[PDB]
Amino acid sequence: ASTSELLRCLGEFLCRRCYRLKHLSPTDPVLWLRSVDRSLLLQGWQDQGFITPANVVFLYMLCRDVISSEVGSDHELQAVLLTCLYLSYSYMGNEISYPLKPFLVESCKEAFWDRCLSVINLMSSKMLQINADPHYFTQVFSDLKNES
Amino acid sequence: QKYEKLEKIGEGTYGTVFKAKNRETHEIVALKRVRLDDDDEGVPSSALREICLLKELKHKNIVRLHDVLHSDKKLTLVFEFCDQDLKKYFDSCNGDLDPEIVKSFLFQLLKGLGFCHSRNVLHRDLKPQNLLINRNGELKLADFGLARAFGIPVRCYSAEVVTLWYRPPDVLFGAKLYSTSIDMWSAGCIFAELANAGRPLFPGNDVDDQLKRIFRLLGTPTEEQWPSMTKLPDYKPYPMYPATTSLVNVVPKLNATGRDLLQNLLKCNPVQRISAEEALQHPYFSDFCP
Numbered sequence: 001a002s003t004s005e006l007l008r009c010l011g012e013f014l015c016r017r018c019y020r021l022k023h024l025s026p027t028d029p030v031l032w033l034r035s036v037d038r039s040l041l042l043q044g045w046q047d048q049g050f051i052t053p054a055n056v057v058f059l060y061m062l063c064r065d066v067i068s069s070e071v072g073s074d075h076e077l078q079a080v081l082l083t084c085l086y087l088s089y090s091y092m093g094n095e096i097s098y099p100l101k102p103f104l105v106e107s108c109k110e111a112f113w114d115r116c117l118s119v120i121n122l123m124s125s126k127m128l129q130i131n132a133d134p135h136y137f138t139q140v141f142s143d144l145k146n147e148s
Numbered sequence: 149q150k151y152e153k154l155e156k157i158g159e160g161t162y163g164t165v166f167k168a169k170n171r172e173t174h175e176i177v178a179l180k181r182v183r184l185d186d187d188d189e190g191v192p193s194s195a196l197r198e199i200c201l202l203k204e205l206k207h208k209n210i211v212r213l214h215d216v217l218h219s220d221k222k223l224t225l226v227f228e229f230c231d232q233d234l235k236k237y238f239d240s241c242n243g244d245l246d247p248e249i250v251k252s253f254l255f256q257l258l259k260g261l262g263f264c265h266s267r268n269v270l271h272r273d274l275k276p277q278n279l280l281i282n283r284n285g286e287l288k289l290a291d292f293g294l295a296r297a298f299g300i301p302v303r304c305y306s307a308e309v310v311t312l313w314y315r316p317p318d319v320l321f322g323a324k325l326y327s328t329s330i331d332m333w334s335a336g337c338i339f340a341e342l343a344n345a346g347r348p349l350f351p352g353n354d355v356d357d358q359l360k361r362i363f364r365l366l367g368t369p370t371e372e373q374w375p376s377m378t379k380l381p382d383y384k385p386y387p388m389y390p391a392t393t394s395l396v397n398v399v400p401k402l403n404a405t406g407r408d409l410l411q412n413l414l415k416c417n418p419v420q421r422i423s424a425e426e427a428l429q430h431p432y433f434s435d436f437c438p
C-alpha cells in the first residue's frame with residue numbers, strides 16, 4: 001500500500017522486462033520518477049506530489065504494455081518511462097497542464113511526440129478502463145505487488 | 149500539406165483553430181494546431197488529455213475527433229466542422245430561441261453528457277462557447293481540455309474547474325471531491341440561458357458574489373437540505389434567502405414542466421442533482437408535454 005513499496009515493484013518490473021540492460025539498477029527508475037515530481041513541486045507547477053499508490057499503479061499499467069523487452073540502453077528506457085509518466089501526469093494529474101522540460105531526455109523532440117501519440121493509440125482505451133472498472137484496477141494493483 | 153486552411157475560427161491559450169479542407173477527399177473539417185516548441189509551458193499536456201478522452205467518446209452529441217497529425221513542431225487535431233458555438237448563435241438570433249429549440253438543445257446536451265458520465269468522464273467546462281451548433285439543429289459537447297476520467301479513489305480533484313458562472317455551490321465552497329453532479333449544475337445554468345435571452349443566470353464577480361446570486365434566487369440550503377454544507381473547506385455563513393422566489397420571470401420560455409427540470413438540475417446539494425439519464429426520462433422530453 002506504500003508509494004516506496006510500489007515504486008520498488010515498478011523498478012524491479014523494469015529490470016526484469018529490460019533484460020539487455022546489464023548495469024540498470026531497480027532504484028534508477030525510482031530516482032528518475034522522484035526527480036521529476038520534486039522538480040515540478042519546487043518550480044510551483046503543482047501543490048502536492050503526483051506520485052501516489054494509484055498513480056504508480058496507472059504508470060505500471062502503461063509501462064507493462066509499452067516498454068519493449070528489447071530496449072537497448074538505460075537512456076532509451078528513461079525516455080520511454082518519462083513518456084509514460086508525462087501521459088500519466090496529463091491524464092490523472094490534478095493540474096490543468098504540465099511542462100515538457102522535466103520529461104524530455106532526448107535531443108530529437110519529434111521522437112518524443114511520436115511516442116506520445118503511439119502510446120495514446122495503444123493505451124487510450126485501458127487508461128479509461130482502469131478508472132471505469134474497479135475490478136481491473138485491483139488486477140493491475142495485485143500484478144504490480146507480485147513483481148517483487 | 150494534407151489540409152488546405154480556409155479561414156480562422158478562433159485562438160487562445162488552447163490554440164489556433166481553422167476551417168480546413170482535406171486536399172484528398174475535399175471534406176470540410178476543423179483543425180486545432182497545438183505548438184510543441186514551448187517546453188516551459190503545459191499546453192501540449194492538456195491537448196493529449198483531450199485526445200485520450202475523445203478517442204473513447206464517439207457519440208453524435210460529442211464533437212468527433214477524426215485524426216491527430218504530427219508535422220513540423222506542431223500537433224494537428226482534426227475535428228468534424230460545426231457552423232458555430234452557442235455564444236455566436238445567441239448573438240445571431242437576439243438571444244431569442246423557439247421553445248422547441250430550447251428543448252432540442254438541452255436534449256442533445258443531456259444525451260452527450262449522459263454518454264460521458266456512463267463512460268466515466270467528467271467534462272468540467274460546460275459553457276455556451278463549448279457547445280457547437282450546426283445549421284441543421286445538431287448540438288455537440290466540445291472542449292475536453294479540462295475533462296477527466298474518474299473511478300480510482302483520490303484525496304481530491306482540482307477545485308479550479310468550470311468558469312465561475314457555471315460552477316456549483318459545493319465547488320465554490322471548495323469541495324475536495326465531486327461526481328458527475330458537477331456537469332449537471334452547468335447544464336442547468338445553460339438551460340436557463342436557452343429559456344430566457346441567452347444571458348448567464350449567475351454572473352458573479354468572484355466566489356462570494358457567485359454564491360450570493362445562486363442563494364438569492366434558489367434560497368439558502370438549510371442543514372436539513374444539505375447537512376455537510378458547513379463542513380466544506382471554504383464554507384462561510386451566507387444570509388438565509390427564502391426558497392419562495394418565483395422562477396417564472398427568470399425562464400419565461402418554460403412552462404411548469406421545464407421549470408421542474410431546471411430546479412432538479414440547480415439543486416445546491418450535489419447528491420440531490422438529477423443525473424443526465426434521469427433528466428432524459430423527465431416529462432419535459434415526453435411526447436405528451438404541453
Ligand SMILES: CN1CCC([C@@](C)(O)c2ccc3cnc(Nc4ccc(-n5cccn5)cc4F)cc3n2)CC1
Pocket residue numbers: 157162165167178180211227228229230231232233236277278280290291292
Ligand atoms: C472554446 N473551445 C476552444 C476549442 C474548440 C475546439 C478546438 O475543441 C473545436 C473543436 C471542433 C470545432 C468544430 N467546429 C468549430 N466551428 C466554429 C465554432 C465557433 C465559431 N465562432 C464563434 C464565434 C465566431 N465564430 C465558428 C466556427 F466555425 C469549432 C471547433 N472547435 C472548442 C471551443
